[PDB]
Amino acid sequence: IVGGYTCGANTVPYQVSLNSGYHFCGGSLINSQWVVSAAHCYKSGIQVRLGEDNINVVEGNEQFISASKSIVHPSYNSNTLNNDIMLIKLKSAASLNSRVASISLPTSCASAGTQCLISGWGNTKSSGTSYPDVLKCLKAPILSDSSCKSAYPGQITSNMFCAGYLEGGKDSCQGDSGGPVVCSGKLQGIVSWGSGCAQKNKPGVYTKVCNYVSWIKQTIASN
Numbered sequence: 001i002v003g004g005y006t007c008g009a010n011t012v013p014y015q016v017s018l019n020s021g022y023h024f025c026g027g028s029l030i031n032s033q034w035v036v037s038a039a040h041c042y043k044s045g046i047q048v049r050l051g052e053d054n055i056n057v058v059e060g061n062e063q064f065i066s067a068s069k070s071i072v073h074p075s076y077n078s079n080t081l082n083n084d085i086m087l088i089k090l091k092s093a094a095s096l097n098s099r100v101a102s103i104s105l106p107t108s109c110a111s112a113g114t115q116c117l118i119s120g121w122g123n124t125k126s127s128g129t130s131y132p133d134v135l136k137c138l139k140a141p142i143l144s145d146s147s148c149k150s151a152y153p154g155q156i157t158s159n160m161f162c163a164g165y166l167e168g169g170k171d172s173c174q175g176d177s178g179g180p181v182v183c184s185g186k187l188q189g190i191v192s193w194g195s196g197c198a199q200k201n202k203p204g205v206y207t208k209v210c211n212y213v214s215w216i217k218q219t220i221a222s223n
Protein backbone atom coordinates (compact mmCIF):
# COMPACT_ATOMS: atom_id res chain seq x y z
CA ILE A 1 0.00 0.00 0.00
CA VAL A 2 1.51 3.29 -1.20
CA GLY A 3 0.27 6.43 0.52
CA GLY A 4 -1.85 4.60 3.10
CA TYR A 5 -1.84 4.19 6.86
CA THR A 6 -1.45 1.46 9.48
CA CYS A 7 -4.84 -0.26 9.76
CA GLY A 8 -4.24 -1.51 13.28
CA ALA A 9 -3.92 -5.06 14.56
CA ASN A 10 -6.84 -7.21 13.37
CA THR A 11 -8.83 -4.10 12.42
CA VAL A 12 -9.60 -5.81 9.08
CA PRO A 13 -10.63 -9.23 10.38
CA TYR A 14 -11.27 -10.71 6.93
CA GLN A 15 -7.84 -9.96 5.43
CA VAL A 16 -5.74 -13.04 4.66
CA SER A 17 -2.08 -13.69 3.88
CA LEU A 18 -1.16 -16.43 1.40
CA ASN A 19 2.11 -18.02 2.52
CA SER A 20 4.38 -20.36 0.55
CA GLY A 21 7.30 -19.89 2.90
CA TYR A 22 6.67 -16.14 2.65
CA HIS A 23 3.81 -13.68 2.13
CA PHE A 24 3.26 -13.42 -1.62
CA CYS A 25 -0.40 -12.36 -1.90
CA GLY A 26 -3.43 -11.39 0.14
CA GLY A 27 -6.95 -12.72 0.32
CA SER A 28 -10.43 -12.19 1.74
CA LEU A 29 -12.24 -14.71 3.93
CA ILE A 30 -15.84 -14.94 2.70
CA ASN A 31 -16.78 -17.80 5.05
CA SER A 32 -15.18 -20.17 7.53
CA GLN A 33 -13.69 -22.38 4.79
CA TRP A 34 -13.33 -20.26 1.63
CA VAL A 35 -11.01 -17.40 0.64
CA VAL A 36 -11.33 -15.17 -2.43
CA SER A 37 -8.06 -14.16 -4.09
CA ALA A 38 -6.68 -13.17 -7.50
CA ALA A 39 -6.14 -15.88 -10.10
CA HIS A 40 -2.69 -14.47 -10.85
CA CYS A 41 -1.86 -15.24 -7.20
CA TYR A 42 -2.21 -18.97 -7.90
CA LYS A 43 0.44 -21.46 -6.85
CA SER A 44 0.68 -24.85 -5.21
CA GLY A 45 1.48 -25.15 -1.52
CA ILE A 46 -0.61 -22.22 -0.29
CA GLN A 47 -0.93 -21.96 3.49
CA VAL A 48 -3.65 -19.47 4.43
CA ARG A 49 -2.71 -17.24 7.37
CA LEU A 50 -5.58 -15.58 9.24
CA GLY A 51 -5.63 -13.19 12.17
CA GLU A 52 -2.39 -11.60 10.98
CA ASP A 53 -1.08 -8.15 11.79
CA ASN A 54 2.71 -8.58 11.84
CA ILE A 55 3.45 -11.33 9.30
CA ASN A 56 6.96 -11.87 10.70
CA VAL A 57 5.91 -12.11 14.37
CA VAL A 58 3.62 -14.62 16.07
CA GLU A 59 1.56 -12.26 18.23
CA GLY A 60 -1.08 -14.70 19.45
CA ASN A 61 -4.23 -14.52 17.32
CA GLU A 62 -3.10 -16.20 14.09
CA GLN A 63 -4.67 -19.20 12.37
CA PHE A 64 -2.46 -21.17 9.97
CA ILE A 65 -4.54 -23.46 7.74
CA SER A 66 -3.20 -25.12 4.61
CA ALA A 67 -5.31 -24.99 1.47
CA SER A 68 -7.11 -28.14 0.35
CA LYS A 69 -8.31 -27.11 -3.13
CA SER A 70 -7.76 -24.14 -5.44
CA ILE A 71 -10.21 -23.11 -8.16
CA VAL A 72 -9.10 -20.53 -10.72
CA HIS A 73 -12.07 -19.03 -12.55
CA PRO A 74 -12.80 -21.04 -15.73
CA SER A 75 -12.32 -17.90 -17.86
CA TYR A 76 -9.18 -16.39 -16.31
CA ASN A 77 -7.02 -14.89 -19.07
CA SER A 78 -3.54 -14.32 -17.64
CA ASN A 79 -2.70 -12.11 -20.62
CA THR A 80 -5.45 -9.55 -19.96
CA LEU A 81 -6.08 -10.45 -16.30
CA ASN A 82 -9.75 -10.75 -17.22
CA ASN A 83 -11.69 -12.79 -14.65
CA ASP A 84 -8.83 -12.34 -12.17
CA ILE A 85 -10.48 -14.30 -9.37
CA MET A 86 -9.81 -17.65 -7.72
CA LEU A 87 -11.30 -19.52 -4.77
CA ILE A 88 -9.22 -21.24 -2.08
CA LYS A 89 -10.68 -23.82 0.29
CA LEU A 90 -9.22 -24.49 3.73
CA LYS A 91 -8.37 -27.99 4.92
CA SER A 92 -10.22 -27.14 8.13
CA ALA A 93 -12.66 -24.35 8.91
CA ALA A 94 -11.61 -21.13 10.58
CA SER A 95 -12.56 -20.32 14.17
CA LEU A 96 -14.67 -17.21 13.61
CA ASN A 97 -14.47 -14.52 16.29
CA SER A 98 -13.96 -10.73 16.40
CA ARG A 99 -10.45 -10.84 14.90
CA VAL A 100 -11.06 -13.55 12.28
CA ALA A 101 -14.32 -12.71 10.48
CA SER A 102 -15.73 -13.28 7.02
CA ILE A 103 -16.62 -10.43 4.67
CA SER A 104 -20.01 -10.20 2.99
CA LEU A 105 -20.32 -10.63 -0.76
CA PRO A 106 -22.09 -7.89 -2.74
CA THR A 107 -25.66 -8.12 -3.98
CA SER A 108 -25.21 -5.15 -6.33
CA CYS A 109 -22.18 -3.52 -7.90
CA ALA A 110 -20.76 -0.50 -6.10
CA SER A 111 -20.83 2.94 -7.70
CA ALA A 112 -18.12 5.33 -8.83
CA GLY A 113 -17.45 7.84 -6.07
CA THR A 114 -18.12 5.24 -3.38
CA GLN A 115 -15.32 5.14 -0.82
CA CYS A 116 -13.63 1.77 -0.32
CA LEU A 117 -10.97 0.25 1.94
CA ILE A 118 -7.91 -1.37 0.33
CA SER A 119 -5.54 -3.29 2.61
CA GLY A 120 -2.50 -5.52 2.24
CA TRP A 121 1.13 -6.19 3.06
CA GLY A 122 2.40 -4.95 -0.30
CA ASN A 123 5.07 -2.45 -1.27
CA THR A 124 4.83 1.05 0.21
CA LYS A 125 7.06 2.97 -2.24
CA SER A 126 6.05 4.02 -5.75
CA SER A 127 9.71 4.66 -6.71
CA GLY A 128 11.55 2.27 -4.44
CA THR A 129 11.02 -0.97 -2.55
CA SER A 130 9.95 -1.29 1.08
CA TYR A 131 7.57 -3.98 2.33
CA PRO A 132 5.62 -3.57 5.58
CA ASP A 133 5.43 -6.16 8.31
CA VAL A 134 2.15 -4.84 9.71
CA LEU A 135 -1.04 -4.41 7.70
CA LYS A 136 -1.50 -1.18 5.75
CA CYS A 137 -4.78 0.42 4.68
CA LEU A 138 -6.02 2.94 2.12
CA LYS A 139 -9.34 4.70 1.56
CA ALA A 140 -10.02 5.27 -2.14
CA PRO A 141 -12.97 6.26 -4.36
CA ILE A 142 -14.08 4.06 -7.22
CA LEU A 143 -13.32 5.95 -10.42
CA SER A 144 -15.80 6.44 -13.24
CA ASP A 145 -15.91 3.91 -16.07
CA SER A 146 -14.90 6.67 -18.48
CA SER A 147 -11.78 7.82 -16.61
CA CYS A 148 -10.79 4.17 -16.08
CA LYS A 149 -10.86 3.29 -19.78
CA SER A 150 -9.12 6.56 -20.64
CA ALA A 151 -6.16 5.67 -18.40
CA TYR A 152 -5.96 2.13 -19.85
CA PRO A 153 -7.21 2.30 -23.45
CA GLY A 154 -8.04 -1.13 -24.82
CA GLN A 155 -7.59 -3.05 -21.57
CA ILE A 156 -10.46 -2.42 -19.14
CA THR A 157 -13.24 -5.01 -19.38
CA SER A 158 -16.66 -5.05 -17.75
CA ASN A 159 -14.96 -7.31 -15.17
CA MET A 160 -12.74 -4.48 -13.90
CA PHE A 161 -13.16 -1.15 -12.14
CA CYS A 162 -10.62 1.56 -11.37
CA ALA A 163 -10.30 2.95 -7.86
CA GLY A 164 -7.86 5.41 -6.35
CA TYR A 165 -6.47 8.84 -7.19
CA LEU A 166 -5.56 10.26 -10.60
CA GLU A 167 -3.17 12.81 -9.06
CA GLY A 168 -0.92 9.96 -7.90
CA GLY A 169 0.49 9.21 -4.45
CA LYS A 170 -2.06 6.66 -3.17
CA ASP A 171 -2.54 3.17 -4.58
CA SER A 172 -2.22 -0.54 -3.95
CA CYS A 173 0.99 -2.22 -5.07
CA GLN A 174 2.82 -5.48 -5.68
CA GLY A 175 2.20 -7.77 -2.70
CA ASP A 176 -1.35 -6.50 -2.11
CA SER A 177 -2.51 -8.66 -5.03
CA GLY A 178 -5.55 -10.76 -4.22
CA GLY A 179 -6.48 -8.50 -1.32
CA PRO A 180 -9.84 -6.94 -0.49
CA VAL A 181 -11.49 -3.79 -1.75
CA VAL A 182 -14.36 -3.40 0.71
CA CYS A 183 -17.06 -0.80 0.04
CA SER A 184 -19.98 -0.42 2.47
CA GLY A 185 -19.22 -3.70 4.23
CA LYS A 186 -19.16 -5.66 0.95
CA LEU A 187 -16.34 -7.16 -1.12
CA GLN A 188 -16.54 -5.20 -4.38
CA GLY A 189 -12.97 -5.44 -5.69
CA ILE A 190 -9.89 -7.64 -5.76
CA VAL A 191 -6.42 -6.14 -6.13
CA SER A 192 -5.63 -7.11 -9.72
CA TRP A 193 -3.12 -4.96 -11.63
CA GLY A 194 -2.00 -1.51 -12.72
CA SER A 195 0.89 0.38 -14.24
CA GLY A 196 3.47 0.74 -11.49
CA CYS A 197 2.12 2.04 -8.20
CA ALA A 198 0.65 5.41 -7.20
CA GLN A 199 1.53 6.96 -10.57
CA LYS A 200 -0.32 9.92 -12.05
CA ASN A 201 -3.21 8.89 -14.33
CA LYS A 202 -2.50 5.20 -13.60
CA PRO A 203 -4.86 4.07 -10.83
CA GLY A 204 -5.38 0.61 -9.43
CA VAL A 205 -7.57 -1.80 -11.40
CA TYR A 206 -9.67 -4.23 -9.37
CA THR A 207 -11.68 -7.34 -10.22
CA LYS A 208 -15.42 -6.61 -10.17
CA VAL A 209 -16.63 -9.17 -7.62
CA CYS A 210 -20.33 -8.35 -8.09
CA ASN A 211 -19.97 -10.01 -11.51
CA TYR A 212 -18.90 -13.29 -9.85
CA VAL A 213 -21.27 -13.76 -6.89
CA SER A 214 -23.27 -16.43 -8.73
CA TRP A 215 -20.10 -18.35 -9.63
CA ILE A 216 -18.74 -18.14 -6.08
CA LYS A 217 -22.03 -19.37 -4.61
CA GLN A 218 -22.50 -22.32 -6.98
CA THR A 219 -18.81 -23.25 -6.80
CA ILE A 220 -18.83 -23.14 -2.99
CA ALA A 221 -22.06 -25.15 -3.18
CA SER A 222 -20.38 -28.06 -5.01
CA ASN A 223 -16.83 -28.21 -3.61
Ligand SMILES: O[C@@H]1[C@@H](O)[C@@H](O)OC[C@H]1O
Pocket residue numbers: 079080154155
Ligand atom coordinates in the same frame (compact mmCIF):
# COMPACT_ATOMS: atom_id res chain seq x y z
O1 LIG B 1 -2.39 -4.47 -19.96
C1 LIG B 1 -2.03 -4.93 -21.24
C2 LIG B 1 -2.89 -6.14 -21.60
O2 LIG B 1 -4.24 -5.74 -21.74
C3 LIG B 1 -2.42 -6.69 -22.91
O3 LIG B 1 -2.44 -5.69 -23.89
O4 LIG B 1 -1.16 -7.16 -22.79
C4 LIG B 1 -0.18 -6.21 -22.42
C5 LIG B 1 -0.56 -5.31 -21.24
O5 LIG B 1 0.23 -4.14 -21.25
Ligand SMILES: [Ca+2]
Pocket residue numbers: 051052053054055056057058059062
Ligand atom coordinates in the same frame (compact mmCIF):
# COMPACT_ATOMS: atom_id res chain seq x y z
CA1 LIG C 1 1.57 -12.66 12.95
